[PDB]
Design a protein around this ligand. Structure first.
Ligand SMILES: C[C@H]1c2cccc(O)c2C(=O)C2=C(O)[C@]3(O)C(=O)C(C(N)=O)=C(O)[C@@H](N(C)C)[C@@H]3[C@@H](O)[C@@H]21
Lengths: 335, 33
């Protein structure tokens, strides 16, 4: 484990989370921070000067402790380690067929991020959109099929990351024990939802009396698990106020095996679609979006700039396990 | 004797122990979408 990379990605996950909640503080949230970190790190491979340092600092790296090369190497090592359960991540670039790219960039993009270069006729707008969405559908096994909605005819490249996850609970719920039960959207508003249940369960457990929340971990068959954080009623805002790498680590470190009388978990499926421009600007990635953008590591010229960053993610939780998928796309016209 | 009832908004974080990566982060405020 490169501890430096692991730390940066967790910090970036909680910064992103807070910004996503700031948009609409009472709505469902689902995203893949790993997908977004990897897509932006891929982008930084082609960046120089202030454009580059802003991306890498935005991703929460300390450029003083680590070099650009070591960061790309850490992501290469991460991607190889990730790809029992089903898990895959992919990177791609879709490039205007005539656009001249540096050999060193396409070679490095393939070697470090596993990325191919797809020739694409962006002026045939609808066919380019179908080529990209098809790539994402394939990578996500049909879970994400409309990441690209609009696509300007003068786009020069689109960088794409996807992640697909499908795992079985090692202690699965029995659908015979799924019953409609109340879910309290607030203290005074509640609806009936399908509520799964498990009886007499020994799982890692931690009651945080100071933060008024209960933490449990449900393992999947692989090396992956789901950490669930359940704030007491009306304590969600309080618990969100403490979220950080340090707090999450303290949560994991405080888990102990404990026999649960019963566990009730809703069966649910949620989906969210985000434009990340405002959030990336807030996190300090600014020059990439302006005419001062320096993506000359891609083409040999300061001729490219980012116009749009979008992210789509889905999460399905059911008796047998969990399915989750996400994709990130970066739209890059001429500067 | 303990009962854990996810009948109110909660967070779910899918993690990989080998790499210490967060794959997905989620807040469920309404499971009826
Ligand atoms: C998967 C880890 C993780 C992933 C993503 C973000 C994180 O913040 C973490 C952790 O902090 C982990 C730990 O702190 C451990 O407590 C942790 O530090 C630890 C260890 N071996 O050092 C463990 O293996 C874990 N538990 C106490 C037995 C636990 C880890 O599972 C997680």
């Amino acid at each position: 484990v490169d501890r430096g990379l692991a730390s940066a990605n967790v910090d970036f996950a909680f910064s992103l989370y807070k910004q996503l909640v700031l948009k609409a503080p009472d709505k469902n949230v689902i995203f893949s921070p790993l997908s977004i970190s990897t897509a932006l790190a891929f982008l930084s491979l082609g960046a120089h000067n202030t454009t580059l340092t802003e991306i890498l600092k935005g991703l929460k790296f300390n450029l003083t402790e680590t070099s650009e090369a070591e960061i790309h190497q850490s992501f290469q090592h991460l991607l190889r380690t990730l790809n029992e359960l089903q898990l895959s991540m992919g990177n791609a670039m879709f490039v205007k067929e005539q656009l001249s790219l540096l050999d060193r960039f396409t070679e490095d993009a393939k070697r470090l991020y596993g990325s191919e270069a797809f020739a694409t006729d962006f002026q045939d707008s609808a066919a380019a959109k179908k080529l990209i969405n098809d790539y994402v559908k394939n990578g996500t096994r049909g879970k994400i099929t409309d990441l690209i909605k609009d696509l300007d005819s003068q786009t020069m490249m689109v960088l794409v990351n996807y992640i697909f996850f499908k795992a079985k609970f090692e202690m699965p719920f029995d659908p015979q024990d799924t019953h409609q039960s109340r879910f309290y959207l607030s203290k005074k508003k509640y609806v009936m939802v399908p509520m799964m249940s498990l009886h007499h369960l020994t799982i890692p457990y931690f009651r945080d009396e100071e933060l008024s929340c209960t933490v449990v971990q449900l393992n999947y068959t692989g090396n992956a698990s789901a950490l669930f954080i359940l704030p007491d009623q009306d304590k969600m805002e309080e618990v969100e106020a403490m979220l950080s790498q340090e707090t999450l680590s303290r949560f994991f470190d405080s888990l102990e095996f404990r026999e649960i009388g019963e566990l009730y978990l809703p069966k649910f499926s949620i989906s969210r679609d985000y434009n990340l421009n405002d959030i990336l600007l807030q996190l300090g990635i600014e020059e990439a979006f302006t005419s001062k953008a320096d993506l000359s590591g891609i083409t040999g010229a300061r001729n490219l700039a980012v116009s749009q960053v979008v992210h789509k993610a889905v999460l399905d939780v059911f008796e047998e396990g969990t399915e989750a998928s996400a994709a990130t796309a970066l739209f890059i016209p001429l500067s | 004797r303990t009962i854990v009832r996810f009948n109110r908004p909660f967070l779910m974080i899918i993690v990989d122990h080998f790499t210490w990566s967060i794959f997905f982060m989620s807040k469920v405020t309404n499971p009826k979408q």
